Amino acid sequence: SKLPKPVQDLIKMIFDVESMKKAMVEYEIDLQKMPLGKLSKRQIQAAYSILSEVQQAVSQGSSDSQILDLSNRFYTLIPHDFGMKKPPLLNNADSVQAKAEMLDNLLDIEVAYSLLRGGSDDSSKDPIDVNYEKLKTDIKVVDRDSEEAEIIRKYVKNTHATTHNAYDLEVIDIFKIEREGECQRYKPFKQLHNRRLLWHGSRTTNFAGILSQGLRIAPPEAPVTGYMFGKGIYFADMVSKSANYCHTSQGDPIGLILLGEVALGNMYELKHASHISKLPKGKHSVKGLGKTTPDPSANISLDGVDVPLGTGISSGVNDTSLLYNEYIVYDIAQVNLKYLLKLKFNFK
Ligand SMILES: NC(=O)c1cccc2nc(-c3ccc([C@@H]4CCCCN4)cc3F)[nH]c12
């Protein structure tokens, strides 16, 4: 391939088939009953629906048995291997949240698989360059000794704390990204002040879907438990908050994290969970107020884009149920993915 090494390694990383199966098994999924090639979008939608019905049964206080049929229905759809004692009973918000979390991931793994299988699996062109196209994203390496790299690295350093210091962060590679399409889609939302460069972390297995389809908002069938401010796109201004969603471990200490410019507009500020969806007039985003915040004085700029790389400090309010700030947008078009980082997590 004509691609740089780092990009070639990035490509292999996100289209890793073993990583997909590892994610499943991790979930207790029986690969013999539900192999990769058997994953279906329709089946996941149906699974989402069952999950929502459970939430309702849980909130109403269904006279059980019904909760048992719901549970049986979900495990019949998504075949898990437990061995004995029987599968857990989805009888609480905590249960559905976990199962829903798994469905989102399976969905992206399915997207990655079908993408990696579609097209001409021919050896005319090298597999790397072929899979690189399926992403429909332009990826370039950002040099270590560039102002870009310097800014980004500082953002990572400053926004990384200690009370969340189970690990340290090492930036291995920085990529500038431009999804084919997302550029004319965001142009209009540019006429929206308050534009910020925020973090978005996710599992490595979700990256083919993300770069290929962009950041998405959960579908209607999906239960809403687990979304403090409703179904939207979540971001942080402190890499510590985002890095928790990369789900890395001493086993696989490397993760991927995005930096996106989001046209926030006027922010509706809240300190506790609230299922918005319909923003108040004049507001174009939600901001969840946390106890920690990057030093406002250290904020920097770039073509109207605010980069809050100031070191973490205590914010005004502490009467919040949030340790960190979060920003939520309800329109995919308010997002412009700009950078992708390959990070190594060094646990203590
Ligand atoms: N990803 C980031 O960088 C990120 C950054 C800041 C806040 C964030 N909040 C989330 C989030 C993730 C998953 C879900 C729900 C949980 C229930 C099952 C369906 N997914 C809900 C969320 F609100 N991500 C955040």
Short mmCIF file of C-alpha atoms and ligand atoms in Angstrom, two decimals, residues 48 96-102 104 199-202 218 223-230 232-237 241-243 245 257 325-328, ligand 1:
data_model
loop_
_atom_site.label_atom_id
_atom_site.label_comp_id
_atom_site.label_asym_id
_atom_site.label_seq_id
_atom_site.Cartn_x
_atom_site.Cartn_y
_atom_site.Cartn_z
CA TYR A 48 -33.48 -3.45 21.60
CA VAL A 96 -30.94 -3.42 30.86
CA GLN A 97 -28.19 -0.78 30.78
CA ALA A 98 -25.53 -3.48 30.55
CA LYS A 99 -27.40 -5.48 27.90
CA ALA A 100 -28.10 -2.32 25.88
CA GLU A 101 -24.43 -1.43 26.09
CA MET A 102 -23.68 -4.80 24.53
CA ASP A 104 -24.71 -0.98 20.69
CA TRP A 199 -13.21 14.35 23.32
CA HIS A 200 -15.14 11.23 22.35
CA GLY A 201 -13.97 7.80 23.45
CA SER A 202 -15.32 4.43 22.34
CA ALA A 218 -29.33 5.64 19.47
CA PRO A 223 -34.25 1.89 25.83
CA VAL A 224 -33.38 5.31 27.25
CA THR A 225 -31.97 4.10 30.57
CA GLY A 226 -28.29 4.96 30.76
CA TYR A 227 -28.54 8.27 28.89
CA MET A 228 -28.45 10.99 31.53
CA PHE A 229 -29.57 13.63 29.03
CA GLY A 230 -31.40 11.56 26.42
CA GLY A 232 -27.61 12.21 21.65
CA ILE A 233 -23.89 12.53 21.05
CA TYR A 234 -21.83 12.86 24.22
CA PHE A 235 -18.49 14.64 24.57
CA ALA A 236 -16.08 15.61 27.35
CA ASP A 237 -13.50 18.38 27.74
CA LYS A 241 -13.93 11.23 31.20
CA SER A 242 -13.70 9.99 27.60
CA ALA A 243 -10.81 7.56 28.06
CA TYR A 245 -15.11 4.53 27.27
CA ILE A 257 -10.13 8.36 21.02
CA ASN A 325 -18.60 18.12 32.33
CA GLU A 326 -20.37 16.57 29.37
CA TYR A 327 -21.75 18.16 26.23
CA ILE A 328 -24.67 16.69 24.34
N1 LIG B 1 -18.11 8.43 24.89
C1 LIG B 1 -17.55 9.56 25.42
O1 LIG B 1 -16.46 10.05 25.13
C2 LIG B 1 -18.38 10.20 26.44
C3 LIG B 1 -17.96 11.37 27.03
C4 LIG B 1 -18.71 11.99 28.00
C5 LIG B 1 -19.90 11.46 28.45
C6 LIG B 1 -20.32 10.28 27.87
N2 LIG B 1 -21.45 9.56 28.12
C7 LIG B 1 -21.42 8.53 27.30
C8 LIG B 1 -22.41 7.48 27.18
C9 LIG B 1 -22.04 6.22 26.76
C10 LIG B 1 -22.98 5.21 26.66
C11 LIG B 1 -24.29 5.45 26.98
C12 LIG B 1 -25.32 4.38 26.92
C13 LIG B 1 -25.24 3.56 28.18
C14 LIG B 1 -26.40 2.59 28.20
C15 LIG B 1 -26.34 1.69 26.99
C16 LIG B 1 -26.30 2.51 25.72
N3 LIG B 1 -25.13 3.42 25.81
C17 LIG B 1 -24.67 6.70 27.40
C18 LIG B 1 -23.74 7.71 27.49
F1 LIG B 1 -24.18 8.91 27.90
N4 LIG B 1 -20.28 8.57 26.54
C19 LIG B 1 -19.57 9.68 26.88
#
